[PDB]
Ligand binder design. Structure first.
Ligand code: ZN
Length: 58
DNA sequence: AGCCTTTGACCAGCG
DNA sequence: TCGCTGGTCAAAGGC
């Protein structure tokens, strides 16, 4: 999606099967992080973005 | 070296 | 207070 991310965890939530993976924008000081649930088919079923990139893309 | 993913255990916050 | 649940740490390993 055009940004750089570093994974920092994966948990298995309630009700929804697919596990959830947490990532953090790797830009210096950038605080955006996101959480991701993908289907068994590898399709994005849910993305939460928590912040906004005060920087340009790479 | 430096950066990433995996993994298991710890944090908090709310009911 | 307790303990489940989602969010995070950080070590151990891979690249
Ligand atoms: Zn960013």
């Amino acid at each position: 999606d055009g940004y750089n991310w570093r994974k920092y965890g994966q948990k298995q939530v309630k009700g929804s099967e697919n596990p959830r993976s947490y990532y953090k924008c790797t830009f210096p000081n950038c605080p955006t992080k996101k959480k991701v649930e993908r289907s068994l088919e590898g399709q994005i079923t849910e993305i939460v973005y928590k912040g906004s990139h005060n920087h340009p893309k790479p």
